[PDB]
């Protein structure tokens, strides 16, 4: 965990140590991304192979990548991959579609389209309700993370008496609450008397903080921070892409099983398996690259990580 933080710039003395947030959130993000139980078991097999490579303490070298690599970072890697597989299986149980679908075969699985005595919490085809609920959940996650970052910067400014930075932070959160209130009121229901007052107070706080921060800088950066808040929506994008690719591959396997389940089902399943493994590795490399980049940019640009 700490290796990813240590790869970047060193923090200054007396500042906030940003290490523990990544172990909390990054495996959770990855579990939201993939949620594939069988592919998680494949990662568990890889982790078992790496644990065997640990117990044979000989270092790891790759001629193609000029890789030189020692047992201790491998131990850190197998621990973090244990966290990976745990979080992705405990999210894939909610995301029960794994290797595509098995509702066509698992009569125990309970859906309105295919009944069963054990229900499945999240469907795939019913994007009417499920997509809206996960989208509001993800934007709530983005809001709470950006609010935590702004609060951390404000607390640091309070501690070190950089009160200009504290005024900048409180103006940032005032603009946050103002734009969020106005957007929610525009998209939401009427009788926004409390919402309108929230927007008024947020705008007034932002203006007064600008006056204290009189040098006139951040008023276009506010919309950039708003887009930064909005940037968390791609978490659903990656997971939905992976899920729908797995679903269509399982649809191909199902088509092979229905037409020629006497003879062609073996070829269909083996072709499906090899396609599964190759496209899944090829796309999950980027999938695991995604949320670490997300946290890297979003938390660290905001709380004050730029300065040495």
């Amino acid at each position: 965990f700490e290796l990813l933080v240590s790869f970047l710039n060193t923090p200054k003395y007396g500042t906030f140590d940003p290490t523990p947030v990544v172990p909390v959130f990054f495996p959770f993000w990855f579990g939201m991304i993939v949620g594939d139980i069988g592919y998680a078991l494949l990662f568990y097999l890889v982790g078992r192979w790496l644990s065997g490579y640990v117990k044979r303490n000989e270092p790891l070298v790759i001629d193609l990548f000029a890789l030189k690599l020692k047992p201790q970072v491998i131990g850190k890697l197998v621990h973090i991959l244990n966290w990976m597989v745990f979080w992705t299986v405990v999210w894939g149980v909610i995301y029960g579609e794994f290797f595509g679908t098995f509702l066509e075969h698992l009569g125990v699985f309970g859906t309105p389209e295919h009944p069963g005595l054990i229900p499945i919490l999240i469907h795939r085809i019913d994007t009417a309700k499920t997509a809206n609920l996960l989208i509001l959940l993800s934007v709530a996650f983005g809001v709470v993370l950006v609010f935590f970052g702004l609060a951390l910067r404000a607390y640091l400014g309070l501690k070190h008496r950089h009160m200009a930075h504290f005024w900048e932070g409180v103006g940032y959160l005032g603009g946050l609450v103002g734009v969020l209130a106005l957007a929610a009121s525009y998209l939401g229901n009427l009788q926004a008397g409390w919402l309108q007052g929230l927007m008024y107070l947020g705008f007034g706080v932002f203006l007064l903080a600008v006056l204290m921060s009189r040098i006139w800088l951040m008023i276009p950066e506010i919309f950039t921070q708003a887009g930064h808040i909005l940037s968390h929506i791609r978490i659903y994008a990656v997971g939905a892409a992976g899920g729908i690719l797995a679903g269509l591959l399982t649809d191909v396997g199902f088509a092979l099983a229905e037409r020629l389940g006497l003879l062609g089902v073996l070829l269909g399943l083996l072709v499906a398996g090899v396609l599964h493994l190759l496209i899944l590795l090829l796309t999950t490399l980027g999938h695991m690259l995604q949320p670490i980049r997300l946290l890297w940019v979003e938390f660290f640009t905001k709380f004050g990580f730029y300065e040495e």
Binding site: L8, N9, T224, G227, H228, L230, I233, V297, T301
Partner: protein
């Protein structure tokens, strides 16, 4: 029925796709200089990542407004 459903779908698709096109054009030239600087420096790696990942707001906003008028449908 209503063919306006098709028209609004066409508008959403063209908007998000052409915004993606513009963002790819934007990111190409920043990445070309950024990786060249980093390959010799390795110290400005962070600043290079901020400079490269900065232009995402336009496509994210395009996806947002697309979902807005999709839900308006």
């Amino acid at each position: 029925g209503g063919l306006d459903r098709g028209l609004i779908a066409v508008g959403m698709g063209l908007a998000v796709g052409l915004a993606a096109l513009g963002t790819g054009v934007a990111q190409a030239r920043i990445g070309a200089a950024g990786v060249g600087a980093i390959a010799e420096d390795r110290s400005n790696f962070g600043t290079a990542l901020i400079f490269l990942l900065l232009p995402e707001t336009l496509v994210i906003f395009g996806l947002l407004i697309a979902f807005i008028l999709n839900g308006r449908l």
